[PDB]
Amino acid sequence: ENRAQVAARQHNRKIVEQYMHTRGEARLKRHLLFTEDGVGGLWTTDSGQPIAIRGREKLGEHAVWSLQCFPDWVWTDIQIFETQDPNWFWVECRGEGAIVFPGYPRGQYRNHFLHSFRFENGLIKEQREFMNPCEQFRSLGIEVPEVRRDGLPS
Amino acid sequence: ENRAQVAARQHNRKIVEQYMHTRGEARLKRHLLFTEDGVGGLWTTDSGQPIAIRGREKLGEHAVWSLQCFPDWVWTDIQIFETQDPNWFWVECRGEGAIVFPGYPRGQYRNHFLHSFRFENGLIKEQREFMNPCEQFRSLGIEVPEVRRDGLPS
Ligand SMILES: O=C(c1ccc(OCCN2CCCCC2)cc1)c1c(-c2ccc(O)cc2)sc2cc(O)ccc12
Ligand SMILES: O=C(c1ccc(OCCN2CCCCC2)cc1)c1c(-c2ccc(O)cc2)sc2cc(O)ccc12
């Protein structure tokens, strides 16, 4: 059992590293790192509900959209965390690039991210990214509300 | 080396468990889980800058404010992740409780959280919590902006 777990963790880490380093046109093939029913998405949005992209066909379509709306995106400062579950990794990183959203001015978007990767049979079954949406609001020119801090100790 | 790493990870895990289960008046003593120069705080805020509380004395003072502002806070759905670093843990969980911020109506706040715990010599050197601030805005009656999604594939 231990040999199987160690083997799974070392392979899975290679997939996480490949995912994090996928840039440019190679993003069009990143759905091949997922299971056929694999899910990937953004868990932190304005609405409070995740934007989850389900299955390889939809994952490949999102990649096409992502090459237009995040054309030069890169992950930086990547720190990969293995866990006690050989099939579950976390990654802390930053991301940055142009943001080209329909109906908004072209901007520059930078944020801090956490990613969760869960594996099944050597491929990603579930990828989730978590960030602070206020920074994406700022990149799009959307006003961010401010919590009033006068009564809070500082 | 392996003996020392295994011992560190087992002890540190117990501290993470104790931290996550601390509620009520026991919150007043939770700063004793930190190093004298330990830091804890919220890394995801409206301003984009962390709210970091530095040093055991200030951590103890924030606990007094925390018991006023979040009088019945509970962490739920706790999943603790050990990592390859025996001194670094991540936690995925939910949190809920009344929110009683100065000058806002009393609310009920629920959110999903990620926590990072870094240890030094048996105590927490750095705790950081990450969430979606839009859910805290909702709990305070603050309007959340909406990204227009008409041009995005759905
Ligand atoms: O910026 C995004 C977004 C960014 C990345 C996403 O997923 C990243 C993970 N990735 C998805 C498939 C490929 C591999 C994993 C999802 C939404 C937002 C949106 C989006 C983008 C494209 C699309 O077709 C539908 C909705 S909508 C939105 C609202 C917000 O408040 C914040 C971000 C957003
Ligand atoms: O909700 C918080 C907040 C909550 C928890 C925080 O820290 C958590 C860690 N802390 C130290 C270690 C032990 C546990 C408490 C910090 C800010 C926000 C604020 C706060 C609360 C109390 C205070 O005295 C000063 C500022 S201000 C603010 C603005 C936002 O956009 C979001 C949250 C907030």
Numbering used by the authors:
A (entry chain A), B (entry chain B): 12 to 165
From the paper:
Modifications by the enzymes PhzE,34 PhzD,35 and PhzF36,37 lead to the highly reactive aminoketone intermediate AOCHC (2).38 Two AOCHC molecules then condense to the tricyclic phenazine scaffold HHPDC (3), either spontaneously or catalyzed by the enzyme PhzB, which is a homodimer and belongs to the nuclear transport factor 2/ketosteroid isomerase family. can be further converted into different biologically active phenazines such as pyocyanin (4) by the enzymes PhzG,40,41 PhzS,42 and PhzM,43 respectively. PhzB in its homodimerized form displays binding sites for two substrate molecules (2) in each monomer. The C-terminus of one monomer functions as a lid, shielding the binding site of the neighboring monomer and thereby contributing to substrate binding and stabilization of the complex. To this end, we initially confirmed the target by performing cocrystallization of RAL with a PhzB ortholog from Burkholderia cepacia (BcPhzB). The active site of BcPhzB features the same amino acids as the target enzymes from P. aeruginosa (overall sequence identity: 58–59%, sequence alignment: Figure S1) but crystallizes more readily than the P. aeruginosa proteins.
Based on a computational drug repurposing study, Ho Sui et al. proposed the FDA-approved selective estrogen receptor modulator (SERM) raloxifene (RAL, 6) as a potential PhzB inhibitor. RAL binds in a different part of the active site compared to the previously reported binding mode of the substrate analogue (1R)-3-oxocyclohexanecarboxylic acid and induces a shift of the C-terminus of the second monomer, which acts as a lid to the active site. This shift enlarges the binding pocket to generate space for the bulkier RAL molecule. Binding of RAL to BcPhzB is mediated by the 6-hydroxy-2-(4-hydroxyphenyl)benzo[b]thiophene scaffold and the 3-acyl moiety. The 6-hydroxy group forms two hydrogen bonds to Asp57 by involving the side chain and the nitrogen of the protein backbone, respectively. The 4′-hydroxy group interacts with the backbone carbonyl of Pro164* (Pro164 of the second protein monomer). This pushes the C-terminus of the second monomer upward and provides additional stabilization. The carbonyl oxygen of the 3-benzoyl moiety forms a hydrogen bond to Gln147 while the 2-ethoxypiperidine moiety is apparently not engaged in polar interactions with the host protein. As predicted in silico by Ho Sui et al.,8 we confirmed binding of RAL to the pyocyanin biosynthesis enzyme PhzB by nDSF and cocrystallization.
